[PDB]
Design a binder for these strands. Structure first.
Ligand code: MG
Ligand code: MG
Ligand code: MG
Ligand code: MG
Ligand code: MG
Ligand code: MG
Ligand code: MG
Ligand code: MG
Ligand code: MG
Ligand code: MG
Ligand code: MG
Ligand code: MG
Ligand code: MG
Ligand code: MG
Ligand code: MG
Ligand code: MG
Ligand code: MG
Lengths: 87, 48, 110, 55, 190, 42
RNA sequence: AAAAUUUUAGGAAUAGUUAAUAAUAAUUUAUAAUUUUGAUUAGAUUGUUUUGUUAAUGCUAUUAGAUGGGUGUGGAAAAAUAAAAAAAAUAAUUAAUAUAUAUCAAUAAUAAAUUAAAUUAAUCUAUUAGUCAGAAAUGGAUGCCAGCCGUUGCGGUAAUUUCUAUGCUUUUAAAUAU
RNA sequence: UAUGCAAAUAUAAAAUUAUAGUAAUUAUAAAUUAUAUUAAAAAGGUAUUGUUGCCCACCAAUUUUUAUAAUAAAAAUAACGUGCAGUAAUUAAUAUAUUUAUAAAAAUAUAUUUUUUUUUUUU
């Protein structure tokens, strides 16, 4: 188990975040493609943290806040958090 | 035929080990101890 | 010695490997050590430890406003008397006075 | 070993446990266990004439 | 009922037959450390706190617990723990006051072994017999001054060398050569 | 693996594991060693 | 009045201050006291019968409740909402029921599927997963793309690993995340 | 070439990297590789249908953590341009030391084989 990947869950299983950016990043070879990465924000003890996580979710009509869960590893190095649903 | 060359037998007068056997195969440390019943990994279990 | 012999763990091989380090690993870490040392030389690092001061905390003299290499970065704040004395030390270290013991010289020491 | 105590690695836990080990405790022989090196070579240049009131 | 499985539960209000009525405190919480400071500037001179700190006393691993059984309880029958102590006299700078260093015992049940720690006490000797380096018996008593609850009950071993040393006008014991350690380098020559 | 945990060559005799446990914390609590200085369970 | 047990990866000095005198001394007397056997500041933290795992010396929890003085009442300060303690005439015991609020607790999918409830019939209409490896597959798209990812890894026109449709698989309080 | 300063492999340790938050690991040794003057016979591989094999630093973009030193440090990384450092590898490599510098690195002083061996029991 790798315990430092969970740094921004802060001892919680799931997180609530707000959408900011959505950009694309290329995974580690030999896997080619475009991985969609959402750049999100949330606040804890009046500090505003920018969270960076893998967008696997389904976007419908335009919506703002997501639910973040931690997984195993993914093709893309450096992105620990995954998306459950969008609200 | 390699398995029939290596055949082992066991004295069943006692039906299980009466003391702990602590022995390692290459890099694999094994403990064979007396129990009330058979407890082991499924494979180890039907080997025993 | 003050400085570090190694950087990172240079002896990592399997147990009972009958040498301190393998060739491969030692070459990797020789690379990293090389880069760090080269950085020290070109940026012209200078450290000092003064008597009757906390020793673990070393005044970095290479960042002092007079001896600073960069024209841009704000260097450091060290006492005026002490900093004068440090400047004098660095300066009068440079050249060999006869009767004194010969000590290794370099471009990057100035 | 709970992962939140001490460092992020495991071995940091056992490195702070060696601080509490029974046979490792500080005494008249083993001293300054936690910082040995800040106090090293501290009195080298401190010249102290030893105390003699008897001839 | 703590011996019943997750699925076996029916009522949460009572123990049907007997056993221990147990509240489950949730031991695995994934509690975390919040990092509020830069690694450069931490607001303490001697120590730095970078992780979750273990808390409690006796709840502290590895457990270190009071050991009643040692030399002192071996020799004495004490009405109250710490009512008797045997120690050495270290220093007399205070009138009618003898400082005494004493050993007591700690037990680590994890490793199954004991350690001796040491502690200083102020003891009250009226009449000023005690010379530095005496082996003394010491007892609990009436509160005397802010820090003195102990009085010198008996001198087990006096210091004969120290007394004769005093009689000649010299200090009982030579003053220690170096004081406490420092983090500086003192250059003092001649 | 110079950097990593020490492993036993064989197992440990379980019987001995149970014999060295005689003075352990649970047995002490049963003997009554620790002083009860607080309310404890209700 | 005391004695024990006291945390921070990389560690330095602390201070209305010790002890004697005495119902003394904002300037009594003294070679004072705490600290590297880890102090004081500073971080975190509600302290010495409560938990979880385990064959087991262990590891891993345990809330909560005592925050200075200043007309000093009172046996004792515990004295400024927040009960569920009958409080100087037997208020009442045919009582345990309290409607819709809260705080931190308090484990409900209670024969989860065929013969019926020795009732008083009151609350509820209750579902998920997989389908390469390893129980279980075929069409159709897609073509290093889109996407899958517990993990080795998969995707290069034939993909038993993507998406979709349909079946099929499960040892039946769910998958997934921490 | 040991009168100033200078603790330091000879091991007390809990998966690799990393100044103790970065990536998800790393390290490793006997299979296999055609030419070294015997009356043809001894040999190495960081590759793995194996030298048209792999790899090394600087030199751009970006991503992310922070203890911001010419131009911060570290980690992900698949461009462009230099070369050819390494696999006994075109002056063998490895470690410490000191110097040097487009970049791998190079010169010297010591130890040493994770380099291949060549062998006078008084002539
Ligand atoms: Mg955590
Ligand atoms: Mg993967
Ligand atoms: Mg070098
Ligand atoms: Mg000369
Ligand atoms: Mg008030
Ligand atoms: Mg199958
Ligand atoms: Mg899927
Ligand atoms: Mg097609
Ligand atoms: Mg198909
Ligand atoms: Mg950055
Ligand atoms: Mg950088
Ligand atoms: Mg080359
Ligand atoms: Mg070379
Ligand atoms: Mg070469
Ligand atoms: Mg070299
Ligand atoms: Mg060069
Ligand atoms: Mg070199």
């Amino acid at each position: 188990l790798f315990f430092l990947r969970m740094w921004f869950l802060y001892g919680c299983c799931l997180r609530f975040v707000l959408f900011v950016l959505c950009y694309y990043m290329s995974p580690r070879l030999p896997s080619s493609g475009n991985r969609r990465v959402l750049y999100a924000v949330f606040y804890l003890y009046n500090f505003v943290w920018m969270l960076r996580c893998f967008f696997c979710c389904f976007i419908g009509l335009v919506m703002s806040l997501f639910i973040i869960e931690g997984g195993g590893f993914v093709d893309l190095p450096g992105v620990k958090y995954y998306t459950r649903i969008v609200s | 035929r390699e398995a029939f060359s290596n055949i082992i037998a066991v004295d069943l007068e006692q039906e299980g080990p009466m003391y702990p056997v602590r022995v390692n195969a290459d890099g694999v440390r094994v403990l064979l101890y007396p129990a009330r019943r058979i407890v082991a990994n499924f494979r180890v279990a039907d080997i025993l | 010695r003050w400085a570090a012999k190694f950087y990172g763990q240079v002896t990592f091989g399997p147990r009972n490997y009958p040498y301190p380090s393998s060739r491969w690993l030692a070459r990797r870490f020789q690379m990293k050590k090389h880069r760090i040392i080269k950085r020290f030389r070109f940026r012209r690092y200078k450290l000092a430890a003064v008597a009757n001061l906390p020793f673990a905390k070393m005044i970095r003299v290479g960042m002092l406003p007079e001896l600073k290499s960069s024209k841009t970065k704000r260097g450091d704040v060290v006492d005026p008397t002490l900093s004068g004395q440090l400047v004098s030390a660095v300066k009068n270290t440079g050249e060999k006075r006869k009767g004194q013991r010969t000590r290794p010289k370099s471009k990057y020491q100035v | 070993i709970a992962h939140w105590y001490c460092g992020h690695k495991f071995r940091h836990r056992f490195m702070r446990d060696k601080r509490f080990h029974p046979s490792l405790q500080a005494s008249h022989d083993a001293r300054n266990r936690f910082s040995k090196r800040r106090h090293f070579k501290t009195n080298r240049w401190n010249y102290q004439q030893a105390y003699r009131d008897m001839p | 009922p703590w011996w019943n499985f997750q699925t076996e539960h029916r009522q949460r209000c009572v123990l049907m037959y007997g056993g221990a009525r147990t509240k489950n405190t949730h031991n695995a919480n994934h509690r975390v450390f919040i990092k509020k400071y830069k690694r450069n500037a931490f607001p303490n001179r001697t120590r730095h706190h970078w992780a979750v700190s273990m808390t409690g006393v006796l709840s502290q691993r590895p457990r270190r617990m009071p050991w009643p059984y040692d030399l002192t309880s071996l020799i004495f029958n004490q009405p109250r723990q710490g009512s008797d102590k045997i120690g050495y006299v270290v220093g007399t700078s205070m009138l009618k006051t003898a400082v005494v260093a004493t050993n007591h015992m700690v037990y680590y049940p994890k490793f199954n072994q004991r350690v001796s720690r040491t502690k200083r006490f102020f003891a009250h000797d009226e009449d000023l017999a005690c010379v530095e380096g005496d082996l003394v018996h010491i007892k609990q008593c009436r509160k005397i001054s802010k820090y003195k609850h102990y009085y010198v009950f008996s001198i087990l071993e006096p210091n004969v060398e120290g007394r004769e040393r005093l009689k000649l006008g010299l200090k009982a014991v030579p003053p220690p050569l170096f004081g406490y350690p420092v983090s500086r380098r003192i250059v003092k020559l001649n | 693996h110079r950097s990593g945990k020490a492993r036993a060559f064989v197992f440990r005799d379980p019987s001995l594991r149970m014999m060295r446990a005689g003075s352990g914390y649970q047995q002490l609590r049963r003997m009554g060693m620790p002083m009860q200085v607080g309310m404890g369970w209700r």
